[PDB]
Symmetry: D2
Subunit: 123 residues, 4 copies
Amino acid sequence: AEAGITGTWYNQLGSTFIVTAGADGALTGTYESAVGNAESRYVLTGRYDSAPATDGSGTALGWTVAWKNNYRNAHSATTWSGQYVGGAEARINTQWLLTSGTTEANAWKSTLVGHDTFTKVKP
Amino acid sequence: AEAGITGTWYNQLGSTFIVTAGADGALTGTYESAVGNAESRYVLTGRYDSAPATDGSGTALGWTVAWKNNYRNAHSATTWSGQYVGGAEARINTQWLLTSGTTEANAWKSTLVGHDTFTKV
Amino acid sequence: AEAGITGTWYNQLGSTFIVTAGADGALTGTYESAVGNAESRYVLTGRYDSAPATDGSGTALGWTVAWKNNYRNAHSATTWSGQYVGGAEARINTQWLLTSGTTEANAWKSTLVGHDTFTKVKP
Amino acid sequence: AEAGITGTWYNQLGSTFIVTAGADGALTGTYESAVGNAESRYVLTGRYDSAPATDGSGTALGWTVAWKNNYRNAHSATTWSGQYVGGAEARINTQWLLTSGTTEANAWKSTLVGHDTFTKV
Ligand SMILES: O=C1N[C@H]2NC(=O)N[C@H]2N1
Ligand SMILES: O=C1N[C@H]2NC(=O)N[C@H]2N1
Ligand SMILES: O=C1N[C@H]2NC(=O)N[C@H]2N1
Ligand SMILES: O=C1N[C@H]2NC(=O)N[C@H]2N1
């Protein structure tokens, strides 16, 4: 649902996710990470299932943040893939992939995998 | 390099990816998968490092596709994370996450992982 | 440390992991899953860093369970990769990959990825 | 098929994997990586479906390598999960997880993921 996803969300590391769910299935907003070679806000763009099921199923969605802004460039991008679960305590449970740009040689070790949970605060 | 991400790419499954990379890091286009509960094109949006490093590195990028369009709603979303490398042969090497919208009971098995390599061939 | 890893462990799904850490860096034991096309115990085999660092670093380790035993055969295998963190509340935090055997055609969708946390109970 | 997993396999990085598949599902052998903070062989142990399905499916298997041996201790472990397919050309297609032992502060970035394909060539 757009309304449920739109808002301010934070995860266990203390990072901030600000998102708006457009009715066409789009997500736009900013991401502030609490860890990494990252400083300030970064632009995020994603997509979500604007039409989930009447099943207590989560709404699938995903987004990307390239870790480059006007203050820093970390030459990497992360994509979060998870599902939004609404209710009184709405959560977005995800798994993510962080890929750094590398030489063909260190490519075998270019992606880190992790998982974050987001708790909503504001709309 | 970078600006050369714009174009039509194909992966080993025969899926077609059409992207436009914008001056500031945005990625926009349509995706058409050869496999799955998917038909026709789906919209995709992503981001890429618009200022990759000397050095001899690839350009990090990623994008998302919610598999819902005027034809099908497969209640899932896929995100590809990888890097683009240009040269006589340019490719995009990625690892993807496909999450379906499940009930809690099946949440443990909601995400598939795989890897795709795209070329303009 | 072998002693710290050896014991009975359970995760958030309610599955049981019984393991013994041999001094050569080996792990052997049984796994009982609470979910899936699984019934009874399954054999697990793994390896761990018998020599972690004097740094509050976790001990890296991994293990595999082929979901075949005398009662069921699910034609799949899972590998858990994580780190053991000892203390009063010892945990093993992992990320796992579950691969099912498939036809070359459905191979694109043969692996599921997830993460489990194990809490120790007994040695 | 299955019993044919025994042998020496090589992956695209040039790493060598030597395994013995036992009648009941066990996998034993040594691994030697072409890349990383690793030197010589390391011991590996794993498991495989000793009774794969008609159908036309691969045999699911997985194994672990703790990168510690009499030469180096890289304080990490890698697990490969995949399936073996036999035929004139047999391969093992895998996705792996490499976890390093970190302090909590760096736990978020302790696991790398990748994919390897092994052949007997
Ligand atoms: O909040 C964060 N999530 C994690 N994933 C990532 O790429 N950086 C970390 N920060
Ligand atoms: O091209 C495709 N890549 C794979 N991942 C995914 O989500 N669907 C499949 N199609
Ligand atoms: O305890 C379990 N862990 C999960 N991973 C897996 O493969 N099956 C599930 N059961
Ligand atoms: O052959 C290798 N595979 C890759 N994964 C890993 O752990 N080290 C690398 N070497």
